[PDB]
């Protein structure tokens, strides 16, 4: 995730122009080896045509130059390109919206779940536990960064989201099968031994408790179903295909013929194809932009802090049910008061 | 269902690239029929009109390829294509996003539902199994594969998703109907059994089992509107004369003409129309992919798992109302304990 | 509702071909008489052009044609008509997601309500009969085929959907708005006497109740929404006059000219504009499908069957509250029993 | 709002063109001011260039003529007309989507709150008068129809919405915002005074009440949202000039120029620019329809019909609340019984 | 926030005209600096081209122009810039639409939570002031005009958002993340105290209570996500490159060349380039709504008015529970009665 909000919360003079100048999560960044590659295969064409051929091959390569630029237009490359960036965009913003957050469920956690001895803080720090534990489960199944922190479950156990308990129950319970759900059965029949025990004093604050624990359940579900659904692979080959072929074409096509034999829109040879490289960026950043957005869950520069929010959910998690439950600031009245 | 998200985490030089050498869910996979149909008529025009014809058929035939060739672009092929691929994949997402997922629900009826000897279990086995068994149902009425696995409900009886009583009480509710809803009054009856002989403790608790219930029911619905209500027939007829009248046309018009009679367009003879056939790759591929996602639940490469999500979905459910019912892991302070 | 959904389950070769051999919901059924009037009308004007004009009233012909064909591009049909029929699609989807479906309240009807005498019995059917009175009220106004069945509510009374007692009842309540919404009044009044009289165990289980039956009336009211608010009817005349200018103009400017004067894209003379004729096939049949899904309600191959949902949701819901209440199949152990 | 739904209801020859005879809500209604400033603009200069010019002049206006005829593509009025538009009818339909119906409310006012005595009638009726009185605070605030129907509060006080107790006590109340959300403070008191005094047998119940309220609220809520949050003042400045430059531009570019000087586009000298003036009546009209429903509770043809909604809305609601308070239909078995 | 919604309520002759002459909100206040350097540079390379340079040099000039107007259209600064504008309004209304309101809340607590006495009013008031502490916690994360306002939590100390009790709570319970979410803990807390202690009648209140702050909790940490997860960075450089780099030849390319050599396009020598002028406006003037929108927290004219909503949602809050709290207005027969 690179943030840049702060900079832009005013309209400016040149207010995006200063963004220009970035390299983390930067066009730039992206686009310069496909860029030198293509770079290379270009001047190596025009070398090859202005040093290598003779007056007939460069006459025939100024008729394939100027076919290839006559059926460019035949590549729909925006229309299949449109289509499969708006796709893009719209799962990866649908896979932060079901990024979990036990925030709701934490403060139901704190409120409800009572007792200040041991055992309820114990109760307590282990409901949202098995919470942050189910929501790191799927995001070990989904996140590269994830995964590489957390290879197999013993270091999940080495980072305290799982007991060694727990880790021998997960094991029991072994199926050929993701096992996230695993810590939404066990936040079940544990907030139903809390309702039993009394830590619970009603069941409609155990429904609202479920009801948060089964919109987090909701959430890793549509995160898993991201993961496994995957945009279909013909559209990803056939949006590759279509950019590769557009510039593949580019490079015989967009060559600067000899203005010595005056054909038209090549009457004046520079050497730099500008306006071809101008495209290139254009076209191909807009393929690796769906390139680093098709998996959020990498290791990109604008990738979604993954382990950042692990980290946080479960700091904040163990502070709200633990040190916050019953600890409030003391009630005095306000500025406006009376 | 064809993953690849792990390849494609980071956005790397020619990640897209390492894509293009698959096979199972592949666009070669879903044009080759197709596109050998039309390399065929292509050539075969061709030798027609380079070898069967006289000068002033072939005159004929150039003036007739000029013809098609500057009036092809009277169909609007990437209107109606973009509109009915974008409609093909809002309705697939859609019909994704409502597969049911007993997991919510088998949290509650592992929790909520009382009793550790052999009736409590019994019920908490058929109160899941009357959901998995409403979503079977449904799932053979919208899948092919489904309906393959199960061809009949004796086939589900077979496979432990219906018992001999059940299939009996079917038999004897019959009407001209589907008859996918009837789990959900065998569960809400039963439910309200379990409430009144006292397996469920709360009211509210029933209330929570009947709302997930009925969330399934919803989604269920969902399924069976979009297997019935169908994408209007008149777009499917009208794509599908576009795209064949298109390539009917490029099979005259993008022929490659004499080159020594001088027109404009057709001053280099290639043999081989690499800017049709790429034109072919993409949008016939367009068609493909919309022919592959109308219908999901097939037996495509990139369509759904069915057989696999309804056997997970029994197997993950029985599990964890039967085994994981006040099955918990030892409760012990954690590594950020004090 | 012309289903095809079973015929499209794999991407196969051709899927798509074997749809264009259908009659009802089809194309060629909703553009016929049009393309008969048009291809009539281009006739007549190329037989005047041909047979009844003189020398210079042929030039004049061939000015005008080549004048309306360089200037027809003005028009911008795709673009208006492309607005409308995203949202005439859109709405057609949104009227069938609010089309209202008893199933989840008569699960809740036939497991909260008890009594397996009488008196219970009749409670839960009219229950049930409210919610079907409601929803075929509804349909009755935003439906042609449902008041076509029903002119009147004395054929709603003689076809089991209203007593004369609830018919007396609805003439007494008369006001000069819609009375669709009466029996949710009638639902909540009974259902509080049902609660009241001990039928209903908890008042929790009465708000499930209403709660599902206020999620019909927000479907119910949304249908009166779209069947009241209609799409601006300026959209309607414009697409209208964009597509019939477009081909009124498509009369003139694509007649094929004299091949003897030698215009430009006039060299070859054929006799069937078969580029004009397939724009018209996609244009006027993006108007039709917009003209046949606009009001998804009537009696169009493609509408919706109403009358069938209306059938199928009474007797489905009189079984569900009536034949099933407590009627539960044998409670047995599974093949996956231990 | 301008209906015409049931004319509308099947496919037919000509569906459309029917429409095409209607004023009301029409597009000549709304485009024939600025199509005859137009129409004597293009008129005027016409007869300057035709008579009052020289020969020079002429020359010079035909240089012009041309000049503009080239360069009015470089305006983008399609794709800021398209995005403004698409802007505008989400925002319509979003408005309509949010404009409050109390049905749902007064089911449960008419079932929960118990008592056929006078107090128990005064409270059904004061709680659902604070739900219209609500509902008509935020329509006076966002529609010129409901404001000129009510200048005052003192008008809604004669209009039986506002009690002159209420009215000082809103005056009490007075802060320098809207004061809409004073009711939903009301209907929660109230409620609560009800429940406590056992008008309300369970707070259930109670909760059901604030809930459906509170839905109100939101939606109240949204329609000050789009009152307040305007689509930005710079869109609406940039298609203005977009559409008011094109057909400025089209008052020169688009005259018919000497057919005698021989320049290409202007072979044939009509008079009546025919693609002109569909194009003016099809991007004109586009802007019209984005001003007609920019704001939608104006006093348009097509706007909605506010006045009707409350009057609707008061009188319901009082009648289900007032009259159908415990007053069922007698209950007796219907056509299918048995 | 620039409000026009009364002065486009009807659908006028010249409506959206009246609008150009704004200035607060403007296209020409966002505008002006741009397009006077663009004005600049024009006139410069113009001068350039027709004083400083020699007959050779301006032949190589014009080469040049013409290369540029002819390889302009390679720039696809539409197709980026719609994608870019449309997912800045989608994030800009969603962004509107997740700023917390806390009216249901306040309607909850001055309802549900009971005393007339100090105690009551305090309990009341330090509920409804931790959700407003909360909302304004996260607007000064989000916003700059709020943290402009608010420099540090001394500062909402000093404002009457926070007690200085609560200010040593914060700084106690400080983690390097932010600590917004740390009211709801309060709330939470405090209003199961409010339960326990009997403020609460029944838990059923408290479960409304805390589903009403925990949508405020889902609304703050949607402008949380908004403020963290920006466009991506690529998206915003690429269309700033696109834009930038259309003017830049622009500069060169639109240049009025010698109509003595009598090039095509550059019959006509004008000195303003209206057309080149109109397209900056346009293309420009997206860009800058697009800065101007992408963070609508800042201190723009058509941004957000968050001081505005945080005063007001404090001064409603405190007023609707501590003023209002069982302050009813005589409950009297209406006009309508009987
Ligand atoms: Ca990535
Ligand atoms: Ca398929
Ligand atoms: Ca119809
Ligand atoms: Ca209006
Ligand atoms: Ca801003
Ligand atoms: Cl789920
Ligand atoms: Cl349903
Ligand atoms: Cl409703
Ligand atoms: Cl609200
Ligand atoms: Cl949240």
């Given at each position: 995730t690179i943030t840049y909000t702060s900079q832009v919360a005013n309209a400016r003079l040149g207010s995006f122009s200063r963004?220009?100048?970035?390299?983390?999560?930067?066009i730039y960044k992206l686009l310069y080896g496909e860029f030198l590659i293509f770079l290379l295969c270009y001047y190596i064409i025009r070398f090859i045509y202005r040093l290598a051929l003779t007056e007939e091959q460069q006459l025939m390569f100024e008729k394939l130059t100027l076919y290839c630029d006559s059926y460019?237009?035949?590549?729909?490359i925006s229309f299949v390109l449109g289509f499969y960036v708006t796709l893009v965009v719209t799962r990866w913003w649908n896979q932060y919206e079901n990024l979990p957050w036990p925030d709701r469920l934490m403060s139901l956690v704190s409120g409800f779940?009572?007792?200040?001895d041991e055992q309820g803080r114990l109760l307590r720090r282990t409901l949202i536990r098995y919470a942050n534990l189910g929501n790191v489960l799927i995001l070990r199944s989904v996140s590269t960064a994830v995964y590489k922190r957390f290879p197999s479950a013993q270091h999940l156990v080495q980072a305290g989201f799982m007991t060694p308990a727990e880790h021998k129950q997960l094991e029991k319970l072994s199926?050929?099968?993701?096992?996230?759900?695993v810590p939404w059965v066990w936040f079940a029949n544990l907030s139903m031994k809390a309702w039993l025990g009394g830590r619970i004093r009603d069941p409609i604050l155990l429904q609202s408790l479920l009801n948060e624990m089964n919109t987090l359940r909701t959430q890793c579900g549509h995160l898993y179903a991201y993961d496994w659904i995957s945009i279909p692979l013909v559209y990803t080959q056939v949006v590759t295909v279509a950019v590769y072929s557009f510039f593949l074409t580019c490079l015989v096509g967009r060559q600067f013929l000899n203005p010595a034999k005056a054909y038209p829109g090549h009457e004046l040879d520079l050497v730099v194809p500008v306006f071809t490289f101008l495209q290139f960026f254009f076209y191909v950043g807009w393929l690796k932009v769906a390139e680093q957005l098709?998996?959020?869950?990498?290791?990109?520069?604008?990738?979604?802090?993954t382990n950042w929010i692990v980290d946080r959910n479960l700091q904040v998690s163990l502070l709200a049910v633990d040190?916050?439950?019953?600890?409030?600031?003391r009630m005095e009245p306000d500025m406006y008061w009376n």
């Open positions: 963004l220009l100048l970035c390299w983390r999560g930067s460019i237009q035949l590549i729909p779940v009572e007792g200040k199926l050929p099968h993701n096992m996230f759900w098709i998996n959020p869950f990498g290791e990109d520069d604008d990738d979604f802090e040190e916050m439950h019953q600890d409030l600031p």
